[PDB]
Design a protein around this ligand. Structure first.
Ligand SMILES: Nc1ccc2c(c1)c(-c1ccccc1)[n+](CCCCCCc1cnnn1CCNc1c3c(nc4ccccc14)CCCC3)c1cc(N)ccc21
Ligand SMILES: Nc1ccc2c(c1)c(-c1ccccc1)[n+](CCCCCCc1cnnn1CCNc1c3c(nc4ccccc14)CCCC3)c1cc(N)ccc21
Ligand SMILES: *[C@@H]1O[C@H](CO[C@@H]2O[C@@H](C)[C@@H](O)[C@@H](O)[C@@H]2O)[C@@H](O)[C@H](O)[C@H]1NC(C)=O
Ligand SMILES: *[C@@H]1O[C@H](CO)[C@@H](O)[C@H](O)[C@H]1NC(C)=O
Ligand SMILES: *[C@@H]1O[C@H](CO)[C@@H](O)[C@H](O)[C@H]1NC(C)=O
Lengths: 531, 536
């Protein structure tokens, strides 16, 4: 037995495992249940807290991944498989993981809680890129990550019903947040200092906790990476959720709400996943079938309405984007694109791609996009068209929602820091034309390059140490800047007037102004006026 | 005759003319000023097409500029050179259809290429006799034969009840056309070559040139064209028949006229010319700048369709054109009608004054289209900055009315067979009396093309005189060959043709020619491709 690996949480005792990080040991408590398995009659239902257990619960391995569609686009390719589930799929999946220093820290340490992305249809806290051992060892952080239900299981809603109220995957996250409030001190974490951080759908989830009062007392700071609660993909109206839910029911042979959900509950999980994709209203990319719903409960209005009127005075937020947010979404649904060629496209392929990238857009709005993004000096150069298609998808779904959120939070009292991440991993297996794709900053924030077996360059290890410091300084103080540093330069807060953000790359911080300011006026101010 | 300079007696189809030896800096030139090319369009000939001048007896004196065509005189700023240099410099009269010819002295040995100038002035003003249009320097230094004509402006030139006998429209363009016919028949008497006639003009002058390009009967009367800071396409140079009818009959109401067309025009014909000018401005459908009340009409005759339709479908295979713009086309139009702007202060304006200005600068625009303009022209990094707003207001007016029309025209002509050369003129005259903020305003390249800086009494710098000599050479090489470049000169950098592929144009300033690509390409996609689709 090892006292440092025995912890008593409120449900009883846990045994963790000493794990090896490059510079020393860390304690890991993996697979801790925070909820009753949401199975059988509990499918689609809010999570209940886990009941207490006897003896010592084994907490030395990651638990099952929440049931989800598995990507078979490019089978065996590292670029796709690194996101695929690395444990058994199961509806019995409400577990969380904790990493701490070894030995467990002496005084209460700031807590980071990670929320994975995956389009609210996939993801797992157990992936290698979300491995908390480096941040625990090097920075002394207590790092927590949870599984939350995705797809139909997490987000299928018949709004107004008792038996499928919507947003239960967000409630899974919220329950893990409560679990941290009540238990994290047993691990040496500080429940008074809890920073949420997430990427993609994880970022939008973080944004949703910011916009939902019952979550607000469970954390103090937030980081949104390449995703937001506002924007075209992260939510749906109640009407639209109802429509998709009842269409999914029809597709699997079902059948009033109670009857309909009862039958959905009799269906094997894989039947639901088999048809999940068929409920989208249009051919589209960067759209997902079952996402958070504007229910009037968890989300009291649309995110757009909530960020416009919210009071964010005592909030600190770090937000940013990568250099090429949209590149990889193209190789899924857009004709002309592939990971295996340079994807040089024609003008026709670009207008066709824009209808798919901006599926809500009328003929006139689609023309406005095309006219804005064309290079009128080289109107038909296939490189510019490819890159423009990528920028359309990235700007519309991520960059301009992020700029919008930053502006509103800062205007209404938040302290905001913003970045753009422009370093492409030397280890990346996606082709060069995709640049720095959606998701490829995470491995740097989590400190993976410090593992010498992963073949990252030396500059990359040092860059990762820099980022871990920004993120943990932010978690500790609300400010990413290193207080033991004059040789700087300083990361300024984002404001609506100056609009300062920084480049995160191998060169030292450069401060820039305006986050695609002209192009975001197009998406955030002009395009909505085209109805 | 018998006692006079024998090098100044010439005969033309209408009769004998006596010209005048004028002094230019480097030598004498011949001038034949005030030659009538039409019957005075007065009395029952008001609003009617011009008839050719009837022959005269004896020797017509051609030593002074004749009357300026009846027009509104600008009195905003009394004493001020910046406005007065464009105002009439001879008596105003409906009897105004005269032209001017300048040639070397002595008159050239072999037939010389002919430039014909067409003045601007919003189709409501202008005169061929202004100092900026003085043909002596091009005649002396480059050996050119230069011809300029007076044509009717305002109501007298463009008031139309389309379909009628008595006010058919476009008669000012017909005056121009008649002077072109007069050059064909007579210019060889002066040593000019009717086989080599280049039209050139600025502002409404340029649009007029473009209208001759687009109208078949004009096409046989010239070989090459220069359009400076103006075009036949675009929002101001024409009106539909319906709209001309509407303005003509509104003007008639306003002067008491008081109901078929003959009756109405007959009563307009009894009105004093100054009554018509006193109400000319009152017929515009909105508060607006860069809009003029009586302009060429799409009649189905002179213009068989809209200029936009004609440049899209035209065959311009054997045509050479030089086109361009000045650095600050719009700046000047702001001091006229936009609240916030003045020649006497820096005109730093607010964001509210900018949206108000945009409604005036783009009067056809819906609420939605006006937001699109404002959003496009806003600097989102400093959206409240009053210097940027001022300059943006100027750019909106300039781009919409001149730069993007010129880009559109250049693109269509080049794509459908023309040889096109394109420029932006960026030198501000050292002698300019408008404020610095206005930059290089609409019209202020003209004095350089005509070579005024060569007159030592006008106080231009030395570099400016050299620059003027350069421009005169580009213009006259273009007139001579269809190519502004010097054939021998290898050291001087070349002006390449504007093409759709490479979109090349040149900077005209004190530094040697720099080649640039894309004429406000991104912003002109907004005005030429997007904005029209905001028709719904
Ligand atoms: N014939 C069928 C039948 C069923 C489904 C099908 C196709 C497809 C599909 C495959 C190819 C082309 C078009 C569609 N998709 C996928 C739709 C597109 C999903 C977009 C990719 C995405 C978006 N957010 N997470 N992921 C999953 C990939 N994981 C990544 C993630 C991240 N970054 C990256 C970067 C590069 C590559 C992958 C990747 C970052 C955050 C988390 C995950 C599914 C999606 C469903 N929700 C359900 C079923 C199916
Ligand atoms: N109280 C009254 C009574 C009657 C009229 C009134 C006002 C005004 C007016 C004056 C000041 C402010 C607003 C309106 N305008 C003028 C409307 C706008 C005129 C725009 C100016 C213009 C445009 N094209 N030619 N010009 C005439 C000036 N000549 C120039 C020309 C050029 N460049 C310049 C550059 C700077 C200054 C002048 C100038 C180049 C080409 C030729 C002429 C008139 C116009 C009319 N068509 C009829 C009546 C009146
Ligand atoms: C600049 O001028 C505009 C117009 O005002 C005119 O000229 C000034 C100097 C005064 O003589 C005034 O009586 C005239 O009407 C103003 O609308 C504008 O506010 C001025 N700009 C500023 C704020 O400097
Ligand atoms: C790349 O390959 C794909 C799939 O085989 C195809 O659809 C596309 O046309 C290709 N593009 C290029 C540049 O060859
Ligand atoms: C320019 O300079 C002359 C000669 O010294 C001076 O007397 C006159 O005032 C100026 N003339 C002009 C054209 O402004």
């Amino acid at each position: 037995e090892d006292p440092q690996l025995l912890v008593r949480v409120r449900g009883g005792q846990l045994r963790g495992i000493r794990l090896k990080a490059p510079g020393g040991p860390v304690s890991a408590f993996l697979g801790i249940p925070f909820a009753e398995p949401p199975v059988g009659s509990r499918r689609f239902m809010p999570p209940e807290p886990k009941r207490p257990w006897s003896g010592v619960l084994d907490a030395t391995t990651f638990q099952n991944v929440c049931y989800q569609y598995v990507d078979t686009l490019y089978p065996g390719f590292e670029g796709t498989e690194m996101w695929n589930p690395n444990r058994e799929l199961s509806e019995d999946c409400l577990y969380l993981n904790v990493w701490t220093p070894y030995p467990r820290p002496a005084s209460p340490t700031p807590v980071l809680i990670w929320i994975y992305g995956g389009g609210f249809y996939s993801g797992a806290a157990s992936l290698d890129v979300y491995d908390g051992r480096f941040l625990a060892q090097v920075e002394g952080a207590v790092l927590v990550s949870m599984n939350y239900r995705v797809g139909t299981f997490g987000f299928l809603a018949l709004p107004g019903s008792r038996e499928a109220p919507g947003n239960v995957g967000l409630l899974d996250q919220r329950l893990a947040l409560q679990w941290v409030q009540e238990n994290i001190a047993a691990f040496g974490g500080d429940p008074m200092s809890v920073t949420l951080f997430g990427e993609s759908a994880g970022a939008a989830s973080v944004g949703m906790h910011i916009l939902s009062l019952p979550s607000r007392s469970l954390f103090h700071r937030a980081v949104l990476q390449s995703g937001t609660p506002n924007g075209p993909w992260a939510t749906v109206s109640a009407g639209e959720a109802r429509r998709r839910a009842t269409l999914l029911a029809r597709l699997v042979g079902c059948p009033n709400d109670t009857e309909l959900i009862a039958c959905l509950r009799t269906r094997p999980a894989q039947d639901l996943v088999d048809h999940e994709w068929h409920v989208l209203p249009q051919e589209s990319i960067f759209r997902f079938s079952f996402v958070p719903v504007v229910d009037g409960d968890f989300l009291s209005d649309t995110p757009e309405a909530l960020i416009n009127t919210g009071d964010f005075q005592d909030l600190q937020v770090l937000v940013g984007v990568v250099k090429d947010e949209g590149s990889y979404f193209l190789v899924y649904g857009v004709p002309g694109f592939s990971k295996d060629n340079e994807s040089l496209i024609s003008r026709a392929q670009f207008l066709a791609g824009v209808r798919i990238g901006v599926p809500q857009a009328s003929d006139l709005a689609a023309e406005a996009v095309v006219l804005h993004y064309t290079d009128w000096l080289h109107p038909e150069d296939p490189t510019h068209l490819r890159d423009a298609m990528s920028a359309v998808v990235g700007d519309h779904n991520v960059v301009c929602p992020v700029a919008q959120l930053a502006g509103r939070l800062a205007a209404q009292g938040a302290r905001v820091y913003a970045y753009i991440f422009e370093h492409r991993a030397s280890t990346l297996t996606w082709p060069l034309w995709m640049g720095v794709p959606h998701g490829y900053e995470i491995e740097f924030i989590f400190g993976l390059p410090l593992d010498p077996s992963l073949n990252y360059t030396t500059e990359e290890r040092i860059f990762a140490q820099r980022l871990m410091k920004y993120w943990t300084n932010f978690a500790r103080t609300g400010d990413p800047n290193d207080p033991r540093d004059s040789k700087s330069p300083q990361w300024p807060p984002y404001t609506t007037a100056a609009q300062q953000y920084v480049s995160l790359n191998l060169k030292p911080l450069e401060v820039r102004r305006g986050l695609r300011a002209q192009t975001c006026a197009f998406w955030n101010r002009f395009l909505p006026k085209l109805l």
